[PDB]
């Protein structure tokens, strides 16, 4: 979400504004994304390597 206009963009922006129903994609579960959309339990384990 670009604070400038507090507009969520990208795959999150398709979900918050309802133009797409689901995002099955490499999307990292973070804190700011929790406030507007809800994730499932994370299907893939990854770490900084």
């Amino acid at each position: 979400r670009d604070a400038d206009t507090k507009i969520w963009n990208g795959m999150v922006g398709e979900l918050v504004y309802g133009k797409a129903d689901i995002a099955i994609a490499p999307l990292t579960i973070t804190l700011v994304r929790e406030e507007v959309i809800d994730f499932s339990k994370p299907f893939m384990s990854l770490g900084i390597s």
Binding site: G10, M11, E14, L15, K19, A20, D21, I22, A23, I24, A25, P26, L27
Partner: peptide, 10 residues
Amino acid sequence: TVVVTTILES
């Protein structure tokens, strides 16, 4: 129908 959004990343 259900719309699946995703990014183009291999």
